[PDB]
Amino acid sequence: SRARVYAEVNSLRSREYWDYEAHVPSWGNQDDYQLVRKLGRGKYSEVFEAINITNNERVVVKILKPVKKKKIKREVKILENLRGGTNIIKLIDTVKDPVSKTPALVFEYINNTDFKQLYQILTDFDIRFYMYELLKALDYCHSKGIMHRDVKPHNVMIDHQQKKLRLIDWGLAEFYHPAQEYNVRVASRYFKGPELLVDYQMYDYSLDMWSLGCMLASMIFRREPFFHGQDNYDQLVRIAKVLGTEELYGYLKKYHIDLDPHFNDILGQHSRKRWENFIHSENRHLVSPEALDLLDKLLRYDHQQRLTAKEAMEHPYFYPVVKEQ
Ligand SMILES: O=C(O)c1ccc(Nc2nc(-c3ccc4ccccc4c3)cs2)cc1O
């Protein structure tokens, strides 16, 4: 219904801060960048490793499919507002081809290790450390009035040699305003919070905390993704088989949420499972009472009862990380 933290923060700032449709970027010259290799492609972008020929810096250039002017302004304005944020990918420049005017965003380079390889070799401390660092990015963006809305392993770049983490891909991110109805077609299937799956539009920063919880679960249990739905309906079934169906119905009742009747054929009845049920010999060294307590406080149906990024960062699970830092 309303965020527990940072709820009014955008209303307390100048309208210019959040009125991205009115934002006028300064578009530099893309000819300063030499594209070296394609790193990947999205629905509305392609990403390249590049060199800034004026200073020989290695960077990443994200070329935007320019038919989305408002969405471009949104991502640019969000990145500008987040500049300097802890563990948020640094926007170095906003550029256009000086002839075609196709826009592109220039980011700091991170030599990331692919999450499928990485998650197989993480230690207990590593998970604590990387989760803490990711939480710093989420607390920062939430404090800046912004929901990421696409938290997932692919958007969390980790250089495991230098121990650097960056939260990337702000193209689905949005400004939080109390009582605003948001599009539920955000996030990757496996990371969608139950609010999205039940078409509850008055969500908030806590959506990102569900997604973070899914990442935590996948890391400590070594099941990636943790909730592996085959479609958006089955995704909720996978969640309910862990969190329970009675607990789902209590959430829906609290918020007066209408459940699409296609769920009637597929949800079944499921008891809440104990998190200890996911422990076995291959993951036992990554699981502790602290880890399970934290996870249990993240992967809750009720978005208002999930820990905030700060509350999570504050949990005993991270004490070993704080003591080292
Ligand atoms: O969008 C942004 O904010 C953004 C910022 C920095 C950044 N840097 C980097 N990306 C990659 C990478 C590697 C393999 C891939 C496979 C499929 C699809 C994409 C892929 C991206 C490595 S280093 C990428 C970004 O997308």
The encoded tokens of residue 100 equal 């075609």
CB 131 within 8 Å of CB 318: yes
Q: Are 44 and 171 in contact (CB under 8 A)?
A: yes
Residues 6+ positions from 151 with CB-CB distance below 8 Å: 138, 167, 187, 191, 208, 211, 212, 215
Cα(213) to centroid(ligand 1), Å: 22
Phi, psi of 80 (to 5 degrees): -60, -45
Helices (H), 31-102: 69-81
Is 208 an active-site residue? no
Closest ligand 1 atom, residue 170 Cα: 3
Q: Which domains does the chain have, with CATH numbers?
A: 1-18+110-325 (1.10.510.10), 19-109 (3.30.200.20)
Peptide bond into 225 cis (omega under 30): yes
Residue holding tokens 């088989």?
241
β-strand partners of 157:
166
Q: Whose Cα sits closest to atom 17 in ligand 1?
A: 40
* Dihedral sign computed on CA atoms, order 117, 317, 228, 167: negative
DSSP-assigned beta bridge partners for residue 325: none
Would you say 245 and 270 are in contact if contact means Cβ atoms under 8 Å apart?
yes
* Amino acid occupying residue 94: T
Strands 33-41 and 91-96: unpaired
Q: Which residue, by CA, sits nearest to atom 15 of ligand 1?
A: 40
Whether residue 6 is annotated as binding a ligand: the answer is no
Quick check: 324 and 224 in contact, CB under 8 A? Answer: no
Distance (Å, rounded) from C-alpha 149 to C-alpha 167? 12
- Mutational pocket test of ligand 1: of 37, 46, 47, the residue with most ligand atoms within 8 Å of the beta carbon: 47
Solved using: X-ray
106 C-alpha vs ligand 1 centroid, how far in Å?
12
Is 310 marked within a binding site? no
CB 93 within 8 A of CB 141: no
- Two structure tokens written together for 289: 């009472």
Rounded CA separation 211/191 (Å): 5
Q: CB of 50 within 8 A of CB of 33?
A: yes
Cβ(33)–Cβ(95) below 8 Å: yes
Residue-wise burial string across 244-269, b where 16 or more C-beta atoms lie within 10 A, e elsewhere: bbeebeebeeeeebeeeeeeeeebee
Q: How far is CA 143 from the centre of its chain?
A: 15
d(CA 207, CA 148): 9
Phi and psi at residue 11, to the nearest 5° = -65, -20
d(CA 9, CA 146): 10
Longest dimension (CA), the chain: 62
Beta bridge partners of 108: 59
> Does 159 sit in the ligand 1 pocket, CB within 6 Å?
no
**41 among annotated binding-site residues:** yes
Helices (H) and strands (E) in the chain, counts: 11, 10
Give 293 Cα–ligand 1 centroid separation in angstroms.
32
Q: Is 45 annotated as a binding residue?
A: yes
Ligand 1 centroid distance, CA of 113 (Å): 11
DSSP letter string, 93-158 = EEEE-TTT--EEEEEE---PPPHHHHTTT--HHHHHHHHHHHHHHHHHHHHTTEE----SGGGEEE
Neighbouring-strand partners of residue 94:
105
The tokens for 265 are 């054929």
Catalytic residue among 93, 150, 169, 204: 150
